[PDB]
Amino acid sequence: IVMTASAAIKTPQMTLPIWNDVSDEQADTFCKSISKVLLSEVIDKVIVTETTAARSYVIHMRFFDNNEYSEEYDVSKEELQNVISNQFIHLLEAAIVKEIKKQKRTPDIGVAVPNSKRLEEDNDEEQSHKKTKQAVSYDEPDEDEIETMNKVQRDRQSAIISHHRFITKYNFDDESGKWCEFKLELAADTEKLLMVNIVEEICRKSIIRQIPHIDRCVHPEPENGKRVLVTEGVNFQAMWDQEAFIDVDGITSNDVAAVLKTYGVEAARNTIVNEINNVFSRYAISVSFRHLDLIADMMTRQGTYLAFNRQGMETSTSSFMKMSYE
């Protein structure tokens, strides 16, 4: 907050207050609907059958039961089919091409792959030093701070075959949503692939659903009688569409720079105050808002989000003060 004023903080969050007519069950469902869902999450098992005109792989995906994954992730069999048809196969063929490539680009064998004394001091020995020391300044930054600063089907199959490099058959359990199966034929000369494993990797990347920037939404216990949802990730405009479940006027965020961009400097100022106060409140440390307001007013003195680092300091009218900083 204070030292980097990061646009990219480690755990960005929005807090969404929910209307009273939204029951607790509806809230829980709503969370599932805006949370990211990967293809692997709904797959129970993948079975791959390989045979040897060319070398062929039959990839059969067994999902969990339709009712189970709808309930768990709010995912429809249509959404599921849709991801396999589009972004999954693409990624898989992509991965395959890249691996076939590798089988042609040749290890070369005989060529090589290209203070602790004080760390050994116990706390008594270390304090014997610190006790006599007359410090020049505050502590030098640690390593962290340094690092920083069947015809609907028949045709859908042909549609898929013509949009891809290796597929020869394709079918989806359109009725019950329990499986998907398709067949890849690769060139006869191609030497063996760990196809099941290539497939595993692409599954864990394939995104069934996802709101841009949002990962998981969660329903925590009503803190102070404020009924609220909490998202890993920030996207205000997307939330502006859920007016039916949440009071958009009371959405708040972790992320000072997001708030700045969407709501302006005064909003961002408040967010800084609250966020710094949240830091101390968790450790039961009490710090007057009078200090916090000043720190935040300072940070926003140019209508922006200025850190207490080189850049913020660089504006100062005093050259002697800068000369004595860095």
Partner 1 sequence: PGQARTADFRTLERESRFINPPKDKSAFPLLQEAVQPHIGSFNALTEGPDGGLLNLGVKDIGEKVIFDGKPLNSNSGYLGNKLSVSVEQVSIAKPMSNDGVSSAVERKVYPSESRQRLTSYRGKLLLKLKWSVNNGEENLFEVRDCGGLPVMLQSNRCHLNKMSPYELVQHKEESDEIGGYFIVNGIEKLIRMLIVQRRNHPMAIIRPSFANRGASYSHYGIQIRSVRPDQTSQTNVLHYLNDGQVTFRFSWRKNEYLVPVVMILKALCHTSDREIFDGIIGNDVKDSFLTDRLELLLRGFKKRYPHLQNRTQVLQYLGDKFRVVFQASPDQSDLEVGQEVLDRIVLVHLGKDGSQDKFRMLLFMIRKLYSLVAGECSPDNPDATQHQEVLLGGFLYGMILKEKIDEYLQNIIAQVRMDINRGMAINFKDKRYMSRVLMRVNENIGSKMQYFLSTGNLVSQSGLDLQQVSGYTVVAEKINFYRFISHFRMVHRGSFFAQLKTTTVRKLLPESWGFLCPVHTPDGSPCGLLNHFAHKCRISTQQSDVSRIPSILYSLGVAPASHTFAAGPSLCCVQIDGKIIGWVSHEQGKIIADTLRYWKVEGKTPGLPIDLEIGYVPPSTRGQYPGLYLFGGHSRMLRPVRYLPLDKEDIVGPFEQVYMNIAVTPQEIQNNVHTHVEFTPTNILSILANLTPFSDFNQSPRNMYQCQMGKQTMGTPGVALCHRSDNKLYRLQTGQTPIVKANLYDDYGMDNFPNGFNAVVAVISYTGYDMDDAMIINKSADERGFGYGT
Partner 2 sequence: SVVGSLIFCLDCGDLLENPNAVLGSNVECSQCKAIYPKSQFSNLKVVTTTADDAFPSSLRAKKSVVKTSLKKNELKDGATIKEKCPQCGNEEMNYHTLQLRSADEGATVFYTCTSCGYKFRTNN
Partner 3 sequence: LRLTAEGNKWRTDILKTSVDTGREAAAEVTNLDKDTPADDPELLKRLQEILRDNNKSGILDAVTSSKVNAITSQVVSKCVPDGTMKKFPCNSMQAMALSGAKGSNVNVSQIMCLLGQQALEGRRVPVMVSGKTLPSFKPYETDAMAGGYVKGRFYSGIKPQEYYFHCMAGREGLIDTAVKTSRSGYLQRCLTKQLE
Which positions lie near partner 3, rule CB under 8 A?
2-3, 137-142, 144-145, 294-295, 298, 308-309, 312-313, 316, 321, 324-325
Choose the one of partner 1, partner 3, partner 2, none that binds residue 309, judging by a C-beta under 5 to 8 angstroms depending on kind. partner 3
Per CB under 8 A, which of residues 191..220 are in contact with partner 2? 191-192, 194-196, 199-200, 203-204
Structure tokens at 217: 């939404």
Select the residue interacting with partner 2 from 27, 34, 36, 64 (CB under 8 A).
64
Helix, strand or coil, per DSSP, at residue 182:
strand
Q: Residue 302 to residues 45, 152, 256, 298, 307: CA-CA distances in angstroms?
A: 56, 61, 15, 9, 11
Least gap, CB of 211 to partner 2 (angstroms): 18
Least gap, CB of 317 to partner 2 (angstroms): 43
221 scored as a contact of partner 2 (CB under 8 A): yes
Least gap, CB of 292 to partner 1 (angstroms): 31
| Contact indicator for 38, 63 with CB cutoff of 8 Å | no
Smallest CA-to-CA distance from 5 within 235, 253, 272 is with 272
- Inter-helix orientation angle 289-299/265-282, to 10°: 140
Q: In this chain, which stretch among 61-69, 79-87, 104-112, 289-297 interacts with partner 1, using CB under 8 A?
A: 104-112
Compute the half-sphere exposure of residue 211: CA atoms within 13 Å on the CB side of its CA. 22
Binding mask 190-219 for partner 1 (x = CB under 8 A): -xx-x--x----------------------
Per CB under 8 A, which of residues 124..163 are in contact with partner 1? 124-126
Contacts of 60 (CB under 8 A, 6+ apart): 46, 47, 48, 49, 179, 180, 181
Choose the one of partner 2, partner 1, partner 3, none that binds residue 110, judging by a C-beta under 5 to 8 angstroms depending on kind. partner 1
Amino acid at 267: A
Beta carbon nearer to partner 3, 122 or 249: 122
DSSP H or E segment with residue 319: helix 319-323
52 scored as a contact of partner 2 (CB under 8 A): yes
Q: What is the DSSP letter of 250?
A: G
Q: Which residues pair with 40 in a beta bridge?
A: none
117 scored as a contact of partner 1 (CB under 8 A): yes
Select the residue interacting with partner 2 from 11, 20, 51, 134 (CB under 8 A).
51
Smallest CA-to-CA distance from 228 within 237, 236, 216, 217 is with 217
- Inter-helix orientation angle 265-282/256-263, to 10°: 160
Residue ranges binding partner 2 (CB under 8 A): 40-52, 54-55, 64, 68-69, 72-73, 123-124, 188-189, 191-192, 194-196, 199-200, 203-204, 221, 282-284
Residue ranges binding partner 1 (CB under 8 A): 99, 102, 107, 109-113, 116-117, 119-126, 191-192, 194, 197
